[PDB]
Every structure is written in structure tokens, then in C-alpha cells.
């Protein structure tokens, strides 16, 4: 199916409190597999899933090498950006980088990503041509002129069309019974009396991986999306995900309502009701 490899770089300046701290994490889909913290003593790159632990120690040395690179480059970015926006040396600021690749079902590069934010907002991002940048404003524009002059995109390309797809296929293969063994939700409705006028019917989905799921209520074939309560999908803490959708119905009327669950983990969509 469609799989993704993404890294998430976060560097935060700590005015007064020494040099900026850098944090990196690596994900395949909704599974984290590495981390790095510049503040950890003798700071290495640490495995965070079982299927990476089975790589030669060089795999981790190389990554370590690269995160230290990333940490130091950011230390400089943070200070040049203060310059750019003409900000004092007083406040904490944040630089974020998300990059990686998507593969299509046939296992070839679909899409590549290289985007930056400053203080939570769009700074610069590599367009889909993999050659030009979208800068968010006049500051990022300076970076566009520089990186386009230097021809930096070409080096991200190298990595995209080289290492990125390569290591994704390697992870997908080395973690099949996790990353391609998709967990179906175990679904159940609960019954929460509120008043004489309404019972809350809550459709629970638990133990699903990956996170993506459609949780929907119908009264008499008729979708209640606009009229239903629905939490943002949440991590169980064991690598699986949770979600519920609730509806306030007149008591007696429960059997008018059917909850529906769509997940790639499901051979066929589940329709269930109260009991």
C-alpha cells in the first residue's frame, strides 16, 4: 500500500540557558523507530522499535553522525533567523524540519518532502519538482535565493531517489508483522443515561493500527456527522490507537442507530448497534 518515511527535527533556543537543544525522531507510518537528543550525554541515535535493533552498529553511528550535523546546522539557523526577522536575543524561538519520502504500492518513490517552519509557521519548503522552493515570506525568500544559488535541492534529491526509498523498503521488510500486519479495531457500543430525554450511545474502536479510521453514526440509514461527538484519535500506549463517536438519542430509540467502522485492517466494514 502507500508507506511513508519521515524525520522530525526540532531545535529550540534557550536564551541564557546555554546553546539550543536539538531533537530528532524517525517514523515509518504511525510507528516511531529512532530518537536523538543533543542534551543526552555522549548523545547517540537510539532504536525505538524492535525491527531496527537488528542493524549493524554502523547504521546507528552514521545516524548519530548525521543528527550531530543537524543539531549544529540548526544552532546557526536559529541565530541567522533572529537576524532575518530582526528579533532580540531575549525570547526562545523554534525551528522544525519534516522531511522524507512516500512510496506507492509498486514500491517506487511517489512523493518527497523537505519543509521547514519557524515558531510554528511555514518558512521554506521544497516543491514537488524537487528543484524550486516555496518561501512563506521575505526572510525565507533570502533562503530561497541562497539555496537555489548553491543548488542545495539537488543534494536532497540525491538522498530522496537514493537512501530514502531504499531504507523505507528495508524497514517495511524487516518490520512486516508490525508495519504491514494492519491491526483491526475491536468495536463496542456503551450506553450512558443522561436524562429522561437522552441516552449517550458511544461507539468505541480499540486496538487498531494504523491510526487512520472512519467512525460514523447513522439513524435510519442517515449520517449524523454534523450531530455527533467524536474525539481525535489517541494512542493506547502499546503501539495501537483509540477513537469513539457518541450520539445523544431518545431512550427506547437506540435500535434506530447503527455505528459504522472503516479500517484497512477490516476485510469488510463492521456495522454494530447497542448490544
Amino acid at each position: 500500500g502507500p508507506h511513508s518515511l519521515r524525520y522530525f527535527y526540532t531545535s529550540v533556543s534557550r536564551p541564557g540557558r546555554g546553546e539550543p537543544r536539538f531533537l530528532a525522531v524517525g517514523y515509518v507510518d504511525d510507528t516511531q523507530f529512532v530518537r536523538f537528543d543533543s542534551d543526552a550525554p555522549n548523545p547517540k541515535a537510539e532504536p525505538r522499535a524492535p525491527w531496527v535493533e537488528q542493524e549493524d552498529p554502523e547504521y546507528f553511528h552514521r545516524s548519530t553522525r548525521i543528527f550531530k550535523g543537524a543539531a549544529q546546522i540548526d544552532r546557526g539557523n536559529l541565530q541567522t533567523l533572529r537576524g532575518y526577522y530582526n528579533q532580540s536575543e531575549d525570547g526562545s524561538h523554534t525551528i522544525q524540519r519534516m522531511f522524507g519520502c512516500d512510496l506507492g504500492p509498486d514500491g517506487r518513490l511517489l512523493r518527497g518532502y523537505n519543509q521547514y517552519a519557524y515558531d510554528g509557521a511555514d518558512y521554506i519548503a521544497l516543491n514537488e519538482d524537487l528543484t524550486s522552493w516555496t518561501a512563506a515570506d521575505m526572510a525565507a525568500q533570502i533562503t530561497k535565493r541562497k539555496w537555489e544559488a548553491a543548488g542545495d535541492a539537488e543534494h536532497y534529491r540525491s538522498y530522496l531517489e537514493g537512501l530514502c526509498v531504499k531504507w523505507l523498503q528495508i524497514y517495511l521488510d524487516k518490520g512486516k508483522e508490525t508495519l504491514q500486519r494492519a491491526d483491526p479495531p475491536k468495536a463496542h457500543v456503551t450506553h450512558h443515561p443522561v436524562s429522561a430525554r437522552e441516552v449517550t450511545l458511544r461507539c468505541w474502536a480499540l486496538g487498531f493500527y494504523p491510526a487512520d479510521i472512519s467512525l460514523t453514526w447513522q439513524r435510519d440509514g442517515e449520517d449524523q456527522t454534523q450531530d455527533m461527538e467524536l474525539v481525535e484519535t489517541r494512542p493506547a500506549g502499546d503501539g495501537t490507537f483509540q477513537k469513539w463517536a457518541a450520539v445523544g438519542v431518545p431512550p427506547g430509540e437506540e435500535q434506530r442507530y447503527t455505528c459504522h467502522v472503516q479500517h484497512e485492517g477490516l476485510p469488510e466494514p463492521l456495522t454494530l448497534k447497542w448490544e
Partner: peptide, 9 residues
């Protein structure tokens, strides 16, 4: 597998 940017901002 990660990558650092050749240049700063």
C-alpha cells in the same frame, strides 16, 4: 535513514 541540509538558512 536521515539527512542534514548541506547549508544553513
Amino acid at each position: 535513514f536521515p539527512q542534514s541540509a548541506p547549508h544553513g538558512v
